[PDB]
Amino acid sequence: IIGGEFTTIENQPWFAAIYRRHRGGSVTYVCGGSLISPCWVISATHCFIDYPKKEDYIVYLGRSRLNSNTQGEMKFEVENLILHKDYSADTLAHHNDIALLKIRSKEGRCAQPSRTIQTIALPSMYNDPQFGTSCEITGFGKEQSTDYLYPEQLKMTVVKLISHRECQQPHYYGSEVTTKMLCAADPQWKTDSCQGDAGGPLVCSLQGRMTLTGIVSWGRGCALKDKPGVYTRVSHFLPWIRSHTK
């Protein structure tokens, strides 16, 4: 997250931190995700597409820091790793950039809700807030485009939903953005998601409830003028989600 503010897991208790083990045994951060039910975390397919073996991944819930333990955290293996069959990627856009991870502990359990671990509601079908609505994004991604390191402490910021029309302007992304995506940006371009935030939550208040409106997917650079963050539009994937979690 470029700009914004440091936070803790209490302020986004559905946030999932997804890591990969390496042959040799190092573990590195991969992507964020969102707990949508006790056994299911939702994220982005591009986070996994290159290394799609489920045994390689570890998921933590209740985590506020990247490389140290948070009191109350829970660690999970990935029982099922489900990537979207229609995923595709070009120079820029990632299409159908959505993935589901079924989580299970060494003790065979799903998530136990606590002060630091809760689920986030899915939106209702094809129902998204209007452009100019402020929403929040959360992640462990870079604080500056040029940074080599990821921040050790979780961050969040606020960005505004941008119309499809605006986002499809050629100086923006043209037709790379589809109706299955949502654009969001800061009016001054001063805050944004960045590398390492992918898979994490875009959350908007919708009918007075907090709703998983989007999933961090792609963009050109970070906090770059005329180049919004692009998010998978969750309200357009509900059949896929339900069908794959039943």
Binding site: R20, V30, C31, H46, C47, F48, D50, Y51, A89, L92, H94, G141, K142, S145, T146, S193, C194, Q195, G196, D197, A198, G199, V216, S217, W218, G219, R220, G221, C222, G229, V230
Partner: peptide, 12 residues
């Protein structure tokens, strides 16, 4: 390889 889209990518 400093962008959203390229997290956990081999090519990078």
């Amino acid at each position: 390889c400093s962008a959203r889209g390229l997290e956990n990518h081999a090519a990078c």
